[PDB]
Amino acid sequence: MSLQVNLLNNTFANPFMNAAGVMCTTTEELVAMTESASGSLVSKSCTPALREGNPTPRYQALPLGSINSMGLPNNGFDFYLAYAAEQHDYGKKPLFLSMSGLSMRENVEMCKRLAAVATEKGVILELNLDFDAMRQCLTAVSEVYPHSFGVKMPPYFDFAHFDAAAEILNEFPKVQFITCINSIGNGLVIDAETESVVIKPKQGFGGLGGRYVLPTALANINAFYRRCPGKLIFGCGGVYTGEDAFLHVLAGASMVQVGTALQEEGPSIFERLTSELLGVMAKKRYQTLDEFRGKVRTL
Template identity: 50%
Template structure:
């Protein structure tokens, strides 16, 4: 009998699947649809302090092998999502939830963490250090000094379970440097990866780019990024303290992709582009496909194969 239960920090979930922040999590209606689905839990849209309209349309496009987007952090503001997760805490049927924040400055991030700290929110907070789609704003996580400063400040004021969302890294030395920084802090988890930044899709028939913001440059998702996502999950699992869990994100289309993320070392797995394409019903298919694959391989729990990818 296959058991998909997984743990992250001190929390337990019925299965490892959830949405990627930014997908099907903008409104309370969408969040409720995720809760009603077969996802193990959910994460809210990355919030700024106040409502934000985001970049001009079209800012997302499905592509044959995935997607490209430059959303610009559209969201309803921190209070909207904080009220939602607090309102669900009294429901025994609701799993622990993830609340994502992505300020446009370190000061804004710290202000939002301070607000959450004052509440009785008992889920997990995710600090998005990887926001490649805000014009003129660099990613904090590509600046190692800024990352360390951010985490120093964050943990001086924030004492609830905290994870960080990271962009993809492409050099083994970057994995070494970043892991050494992350290992200094009592992080509950890391989430790797965000979209692969500044891709460009060109429609040859119309001779145009696919999206409007940033002249067409945007974050890639879907099958395009699966190998990069798996590399980041595995590289960090090899380097991080064992008590820091990993959420694997990127390129999941089917149960085999979920299996690969867990084999690489992920404790939980997020779904973005495929959720955007299929809607919350995707979680029913993915859990069934993962269950079928584990049954074929005679694995009964995720721990039977987590992090056990073989090298040649």
């Protein structure tokens, strides 16, 4: 039995990594992710300059997941670039760098600088991604960034959107992975006890993660798995167990990202997840992920 994944000219010990933004902002966090049992890691979605992010509380753990409006608190692009360039032990595992410029211009400028580090060190861009704005952003990055990269996608909720998004993504051969999904946007958690919202920014509206989002994540993983056969899908959303991960891979996921569960449990979770996924595969008589990836049975 093996959880090994081979993709993007890299070998991964297992499909697991953090979801961008979860436990990957500080040096300590990046180190902890590198030292963890995870197959990879992704750095916090960065902007050109450090960002304080939104006022607190801006994250709330919930019985069925989480809600957040972090507001991109990050150490800035130079920080994550320097980690990728000078600090990350690529001997331990490959590194993804998540980028979330606040404009096309910002992404272009960061990508221009990232190019050299990707070339020299092998850091892989996960570009945090209105289909016109999407086409423009990808066009700009593809134009200036001389490497394959991946895109972190918001969830879509109908086939028309799955088709529209896939059509655009398929126009960009440099997009070699698609990460499905980011949060289900702008949920509103209300605490019955306090008769209030639970996060401060944006009147309590924030992205949902965790158990809430698993079927949506699976839908999106599978939708793009089907519609972008030339591309890899990374799953993200609602993974708390090896069984959840199994579902992601069955839907078509190559890598499996862990946000909310990781936020609650810390990087030790990856030891548990590898163990559980191996346990699931053992019970189901699977030896490799290739044996069932994308093989979800329809009726």
